[PDB]
């Protein structure tokens, strides 16, 4: 409903597992908000999701959403894993978990409330705001202040 909230998200870390940071803006109405935290041990696949989650949980109104991000892991994900995963219960084929379930089931919840269109960016040139999430993220991964509690080297 809500005119047309604009999000931009990055993550970044750097090892895998190793420290890694989010960044995320929101453009709600003519205001613009930020988000940027750093994890003490995680992934970049985590960063990437934790992004998008955060600015969409900070939204308490149904609303239409443009939400911009060059990631692949996410953009798969939404484009052609996660029906298919519903389906099966959230298992992959040998009846585990599928990996990052805590996080895809937490983007899944903030999905269905609403107007969602993704625009999948290639890679900052020309995009500025995803090149300033991305400054925010790299600085998080710098000075991690929590810890990603739902990461697991088992699964």
């Not at 955060?54 to 892991?73: G, N, R």
Request: proline share 3%; with cysteine; hydrophobic share 35%.
């Amino acid at each position: 409903m809500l005119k047309q909230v604009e999000i931009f998200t990055d993550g970044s870390c750097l090892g895998n597992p190793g420290p890694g940071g989010y960044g995320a803006i929101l453009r709600y109405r003519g205001r613009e908000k930020t988000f940027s935290a750093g994890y003490t041990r995680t992934t970049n696949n985590r960063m990437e999701l934790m992004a998008a989650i955060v600015a969409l949980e900070a939204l308490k109104e149904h609303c239409e959403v443009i939400l911009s991000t060059d990631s692949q892991y996410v953009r798969q994900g939404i484009t052609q894993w996660i029906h298919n995963w519903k389906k099966r219960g959230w298992k992959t084929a040998d009846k585990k978990p599928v990996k990052n379930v805590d996080l895809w089931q937490r983007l899944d919840a903030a999905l269905g409330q609403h107007q969602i269109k993704w625009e999948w960016v290639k890679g900052h040139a020309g995009h500025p705001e995803n090149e300033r999430c991305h400054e925010l993220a790299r600085a998080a991964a710098m000075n991690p202040t929590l810890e990603d509690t739902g990461y697991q080297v088992e699964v």
